[PDB]
Amino acid sequence: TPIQTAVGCVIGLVNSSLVVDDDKCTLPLGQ
Amino acid sequence: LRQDESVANLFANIKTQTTQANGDFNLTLLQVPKVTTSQYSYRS
Ligand SMILES: *[C@@H]1O[C@H](CO)[C@@H](O)[C@H](O)[C@H]1NC(C)=O
Ligand SMILES: *[C@@H]1O[C@H](CO)[C@@H](O)[C@H](O)[C@H]1NC(C)=O
Numbered sequence: 001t002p003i004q005t006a007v008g009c010v011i012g013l014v015n016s017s018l019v020v021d022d023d024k025c026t027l028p029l030g031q
Numbered sequence: 032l033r034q035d036e037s038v039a040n041l042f043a044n045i046k047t048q049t050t051q052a053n054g055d056f057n058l059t060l061l062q063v064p065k066v067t068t069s070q071y072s073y074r075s
Binding site: 021023028 | 035041042043
């Protein structure tokens with residue numbers, strides 16, 4: 001199921017309401 | 032990728048460890064307004 005993000009809507013990612021911080025976020029994905 | 036790394040390094044460098052929660056100095060321009068006229072909640 002595709003989901004709508006702030007960098008365009010993506011296919012293959014799940015939305016789990018998980019929050020990471022800086023200096024642990026690889027694949028910064030834009031925004 | 033180098034631009035993203037430089038931006039991350041800058042915003043990690045300008046961070047502060049400890050903060051505090053005015054006097055007769057009027058600092059309403061520097062702080063967040065009470066009623067937001069913008070779509071960003073943290074913009075001054
Ligand atoms: C993930 O789901 C929650 C609850 O359905 C929603 O509030 C949130 O906006 C979703 N994430 C994104 C990036 O839209
Ligand atoms: C500080 O300046 C703003 C500028 O518009 C003004 O609205 C506000 O009343 C001032 N604060 C005081 C305490 O005078």
